[PDB]
Homo-oligomer: A and B are copies of this chain.
């Protein structure tokens, strides 16, 4: 019984995929996504819109869960949590949770009783009409560099689509780097990929 959740992409029978908005070119843009690295660069405590795309409409009662895990093998089995500084100076969200959802009246924050991992869950809502996706506003409450938290360790966010019975319907993931200057750090990484990847 592993305590490390799968990160394997599983688009499933509903054709579940993630979308991200294009952003500005600014050195310190608040949120920016790199398709080449499948990686979000964003600033702490600010909005990161993630779009949910499906080919088929999930059944009523379907839920959307987000959870962070460390990306490197050496840190994979350690629970991702808020650093003690940002925990201390911290409504519904427990202070130890890294990932929050804003703008949803039905958000649930879970602390797994066996694996101790944190996750945040909202109801899946189908797009309104004309629209092809549904947007969730996530918030990361620490910088990747936070001492006693992520401590410079890369993380993945895993988004899972789950029915009310608990069956996995779909899964996707993206890397996240919460940092002061997302535009600078995105360009630096893409350039490093080009020259020495």
Contact = CB atoms under 8 A, between A and B. Distances in A.
Contact of A88 (B89, B146, B148): B148
Most buried by B among A83, A84, A89, A146: A84
14 contacts: A83-B85, A83-B147, A84-B84, A84-B85, A84-B87, A84-B88, A84-B148, A85-B85, A85-B147, A85-B148, A88-B148, A89-B148, A146-B147, A147-B147
Contacts of A146: 147
Interface string A136-149: 00000000001110
Closest 8 CB pairs of A and B: A85-B148, A84-B84, A84-B88, A84-B85, A85-B147, A147-B147, A85-B85, A83-B85
Contacts of A89: 148
Nearest to A85: B148
A88 to B, nearest CB: 5
A17 to B, nearest CB: 37
Interface in A78-114: 83-85, 87-89
A142 to B, nearest CB: 10
Contacts of A84: 84-85, 87-88, 148
Given A84-B84, A147-B147, 10 more contacts: A83-B85, A83-B147, A84-B85, A84-B88, A84-B148, A85-B85, A85-B147, A85-B148, A88-B148, A146-B147
A47 B88 CA distance: 29
A143 to B, nearest CB: 9
Contacts of A87: 84
Interface string A116-148: 000000000000000000000000000000111
A89 B148 CA distance: 9
Contacts of A147: 83, 85, 146-147
